[PDB]
């Protein structure tokens, strides 16, 4: 009956935790001892992208590690040449209420989504000189919080309808829909092999999903408040989260639990974006205290701040070659830190 | 210079995009952003039907001031994760049905929504245009059913003028910042036209009281 099902869910969660704590042979923070710390390293800004006129909510790097895309509330999807601070494109969005943007791994396509519950896919390399919508991916019953291009034809979107969904650009329909996530999903991060993806929601739980199978493979809990951002380790077997609970937690896929809590007593603001540097030795976390804290991802200490923003940092991401990290913020400014 | 014949024109493209973005941002800065809120089925659509799925953005022009109102009540998500998008709105057009004081109570749910948005950290310094509408149903409901059948804390009688003004004073009393922001309360019905004038007249007071605060004048 109903009593057994609640008891079964309670005993299964206890059974998951019983096996989870048994595998905790040694914490990663204790394991990473007698190692050389990264140290206080200053990463001064190199280029300041100064085109946006409203709060920037998302940015993404091209796989060439030079092209950049960014979305703000002035109804603009600016494409940056980060090397020379040049505007490659500026796309007028029909709905200025966007909370995410994405760059295709190929580079031909750029996505954006937000409060209009629609993922708009923009074709950059058209025969015409303008940037036009390929297919608007309507079908979500909540705000679109994050989106990431799988291929030129596949993109999985994290929405405010408490569900994630993998789409298909050719047909415009969700090939699979990822359900079972109580509370609305606020961010997602595709794997380097583009096979699995995790997603952070307002249940303070990060769930790993199989893209093809459509099944929630694993659940990661431990955050006290809602998760605003997530990011895979470059290896693809681990990921770090960013939550309003004011700590970043590194979850391992195989270990199926936490590794560290990147928490400081002097910091109470909630993380808005999280990005792993190449080799995963540095974690770039975009905090809400007008600053990004560069966390040495293998230790519990901080590798330094970069600051340089007059408002809350809302988006940041390192390049695909690790050359630089761009940190957008609500002050309509993008700074390339290196 | 050390600029190629194509890097010179790539810079020219960037310079010419900035001229388009400045022109787009100067046009977007003259559009008044209003965040429409209030409980569902509380006369919200009434104060939109006089002029001109997630956000139902509504644009209406009044006295050479381009407005832009965001009917956001269709989100049905955790509002704490997308209400920060509406920083810098001129006012919050809150719509509360007066007749919904007894239909578990809509007024208590609507009063709780006013608490959650007047005391919000993102809206600590923006005004609220409270719209106590559907007085026509409120008039017939007060005469047929006294307010003491649902509200025993009321001291006044079951009249109209003192009962309606009681809800006005019971809704501008939850502002934890009585001086940083001002609730501009209006009374409207279905057969009314001055509601759009009240929104234009209120935001002019919002703009000026921000303009005076800009150049240290008030």
């Amino acid at each position: 009956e109903l009593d057994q099902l609640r008891q079964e869910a309670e005993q299964l969660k206890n059974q998951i935790r019983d096996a989870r704590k048994a595998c905790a042979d040694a914490t990663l923070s204790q394991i990473t001892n007698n190692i050389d710390p990264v140290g206080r390293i200053q990463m001064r800004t190199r280029r300041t992208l100064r085109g946006h006129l409203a709060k920037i909510y998302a940015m993404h790097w091209g796989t060439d590690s030079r092209l950049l895309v960014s979305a703000s509330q002035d109804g603009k999807l600016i494409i940056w040449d980060s090397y020379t601070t040049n505007k490659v494109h500026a796309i007028p969005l029909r709905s200025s209420w966007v909370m995410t943007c994405a760059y295709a791994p190929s580079g031909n396509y750029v996505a954006c989504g937000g409060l209009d519950n629609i993922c708009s896919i923009y074709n950059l390399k058209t025969r015409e000189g303008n940037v036009r919508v390929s297919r608007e991916l309507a079908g979500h019953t909540g705000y679109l919080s994050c989106c990431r291009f799988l291929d030129d034809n596949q993109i999985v979107t994290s929405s405010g309808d408490t569900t994630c969904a993998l789409w298909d650009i050719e047909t415009g329909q969700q090939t699979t829909t990822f359900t079972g996530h109580t509370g609305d999903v606020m961010s997602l991060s595709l794997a380097p092999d583009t096979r699995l993806f995790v997603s952070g929601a307002c249940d303070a739980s990060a769930k790993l999903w199989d893209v093809r199978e459509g099944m929630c493979r694993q659940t990661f809990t431990g955050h006290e408040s809602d998760i605003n951002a997530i990011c895979f380790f470059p290896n693809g077997n681990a990921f770090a989260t960013g939550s309003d609970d004011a700590t970043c937690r590194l979850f391992d896929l195989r270990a199926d639990q936490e590794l560290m809590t990147y928490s400081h007593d002097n910091i109470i603001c909630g993380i808005t974006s999280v990005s792993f540097s190449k080799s995963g030795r540095l974690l770039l976390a975009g905090y809400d205290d007008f600053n990004c804290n560069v966390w040495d991802a293998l230790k519990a200490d901080r590798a330094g701040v970069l600051a340089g923003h007059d408002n809350r940092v809302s988006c940041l991401g390192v390049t695909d070659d690790g050359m630089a990290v761009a940190t957008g913020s609500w002050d309509s400014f993008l700074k390339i830190w290196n | 210079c050390t600029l190629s014949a194509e890097d010179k024109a790539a810079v020219e493209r960037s310079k010419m995009i900035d001229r388009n973005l400045r022109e787009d941002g100067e046009k977007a800065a003259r559009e008044v952003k209003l965040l429409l809120l209030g409980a569902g089925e509380s006369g919200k659509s009434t104060i939109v039907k006089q002029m001109k799925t997630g956000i139902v953005e509504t644009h209406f022009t009044f006295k050479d001031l381009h407005f832009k109102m965001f009917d956001v009540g269709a989100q049905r998500s955790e509002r704490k994760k997308w209400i920060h998008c509406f920083e810098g709105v001129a006012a919050i057009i809150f719509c509360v049905a007066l007749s919904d004081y007894d239909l578990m109570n809509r007024m208590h749910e609507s009063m709780k929504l006013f608490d959650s948005i007047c005391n919000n950290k993102w809206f600590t310094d923006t005004s609220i245009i409270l719209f106590l509408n559907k007085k026509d149903l409120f008039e017939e409901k007060i005469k047929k059913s006294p307010l003491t059948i649902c509200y025993q804390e009321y001291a006044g009688s079951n009249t109209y003028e003192e009962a309606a003004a009681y809800i006005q004073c019971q809704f501008e009393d939850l502002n934890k910042r009585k001086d940083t922001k001002e609730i501009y309360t209006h009374f409207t019905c279905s057969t009314d036209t001055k509601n759009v004038q009240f929104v234009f007249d209120a935001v002019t007071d919002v703009i000026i009281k921000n303009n005076l605060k800009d150049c240290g004048l008030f």
Partner: single-chain antibody
Amino acid sequence: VQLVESGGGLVQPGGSRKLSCSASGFAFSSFGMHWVRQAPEKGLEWVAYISSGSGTIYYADTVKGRFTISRDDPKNTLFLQMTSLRSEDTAMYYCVRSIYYYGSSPFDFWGQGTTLTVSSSDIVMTQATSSVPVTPGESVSISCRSSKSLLHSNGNTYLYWFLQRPGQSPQLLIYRMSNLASGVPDRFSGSGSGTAFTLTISRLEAEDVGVYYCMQHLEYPLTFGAGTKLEL
């Protein structure tokens, strides 16, 4: 995507003739337009370049001053006004579009151009190969010679490879050292380094034959190579 160039014809010496291009099918207002001439017996020769929004305007040193260029962004129309048409202006003036951003492919689409007839510092681009005979299905690697290195400090080598098939407007093949254009087969492969430049084809069909033109874009004025006419 088309560029219907209008005007032109038989013009008396010393007169003027307004050349117009009816650009359509694309976002013309963000395209830096060009003009490329071609004598009936000689090779291509660049004429002018008006950037987007009627910005920076360049001219060839041969016809600078007496050639004045203009564009009409709302009408999607590109004009070229020239006065005192000498005996050396009996060339076919092609109209080219070109956009400049990172990863862009300038000179990608060329208009069919107009025929003009009259009554009667720079980087040198030379290709000693001409009237090259080759059978289809083989591999041909023609070469183009530059006066100096086209490789820049940023790392972009502004060499361009075109293909004027017999009786048709030129078509871009390789818009950099090796950057293959969009809409052309993968068989084409430009190469070379520094001053020496070459364009290689894996196998050639009966279609990709004609005269191949090499062109620099390092700085203005832009100079084309001579006629490298592939023969079947």
